[PDB]
Amino acid sequence: MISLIAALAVDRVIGMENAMPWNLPADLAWFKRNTLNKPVIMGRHTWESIGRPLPGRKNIILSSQPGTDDRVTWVKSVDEAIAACGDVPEIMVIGGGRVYEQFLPKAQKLYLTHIDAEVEGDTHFPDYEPDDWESVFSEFHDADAQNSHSYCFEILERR
Ligand SMILES: NC(=O)c1ccc[n+]([C@@H]2O[C@H](COP(=O)([O-])OP(=O)(O)OC[C@H]3O[C@@H](n4cnc5c(N)ncnc54)[C@H](OP(=O)(O)O)[C@@H]3O)[C@@H](O)[C@H]2O)c1
Ligand SMILES: Nc1nc(=O)c2nc(CNc3ccc(C(=O)N[C@@H](CCC(=O)O)C(=O)O)cc3)cnc2[nH]1
Numbered sequence: 001m002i003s004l005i006a007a008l009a010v011d012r013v014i015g016m017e018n019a020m021p022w023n024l025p026a027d028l029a030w031f032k033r034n035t036l037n038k039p040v041i042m043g044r045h046t047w048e049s050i051g052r053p054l055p056g057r058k059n060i061i062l063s064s065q066p067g068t069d070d071r072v073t074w075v076k077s078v079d080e081a082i083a084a085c086g087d088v089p090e091i092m093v094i095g096g097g098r099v100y101e102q103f104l105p106k107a108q109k110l111y112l113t114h115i116d117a118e119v120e121g122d123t124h125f126p127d128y129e130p131d132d133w134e135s136v137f138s139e140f141h142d143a144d145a146q147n148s149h150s151y152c153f154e155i156l157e158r159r
């Protein structure tokens with residue numbers, strides 16, 4: 001019952017200095033629509049990148065150190081993170097790079113936004129095995145006044 005959601009620029013770049021530079025409100029909105037009312041699991045750097053809880057979602061932060069904010073749930077292993085979600089039928093893993101690597105093998109579904117942008121990055125989505133993933137949906141959007149790049153929302157399910 002595990003899904004990854006991520007937005008990927010050119011070469012699978014997902015981040016640079018604890019930021020997406022990416023500003024795509026339509027994508028952030030897609031993210032909200034696919035995560036609201038589900039638990040989200042993230043790594044500590046992603047927690048710091050976002051800088052505040054995501055409302056309307058149980059926020060679960062992976063770290064090895066004691067937690068530093070009781071507005072969210074802290075866990076110290078992948079298995080503890082899954083357990084902490086409660087007994088639900090969709091858990092959303094929201095990154096970052098190191099967390100996506102761990103959860104990939106388990107996960108059954110990938111919500112990937114392909115952004116037509118070149119960013120010189122320090123974090124990448126895993127180089128996953130494409131043969132193992134069926135595209136069940138793909139919608140492309142051209143750039144507009146609110147969104148400076150074109151981008152494509154797709155959902156993959158394991159074959
Ligand atoms: N494009 C996107 O969709 C997207 C999504 C998410 C994030 N990002 C970007 O990705 C970057 C952050 O990713 P990152 O790869 O540097 O870091 P990350 O995966 O967010 O965080 C890694 C940290 O999480 C903790 N952690 C990971 N696995 C753990 C485990 N099994 N057990 C216990 N703790 C564990 C550790 O914290 P401790 O060191 O405290 O132990 C580890 O250093 C930023 O640039 C961010 O903006 C992009
Ligand atoms: N498709 C996708 N896009 C992303 O932007 C994204 N971001 C993360 C991790 N980082 C973030 C960063 C910001 C917000 C955010 O503020 N989103 C709001 C709605 C839009 C907004 O108000 O900015 C939210 O409540 O989720 C969410 C996740 C993980 N997977 C992703 N996946």
Ligand SMILES: [Mn+2]
Pocket residue numbers: 115116117118149
């Ligand atoms: Mn571009």
Ligand SMILES: [Mn+2]
Pocket residue numbers: 135137138
């Ligand atoms: Mn397709």
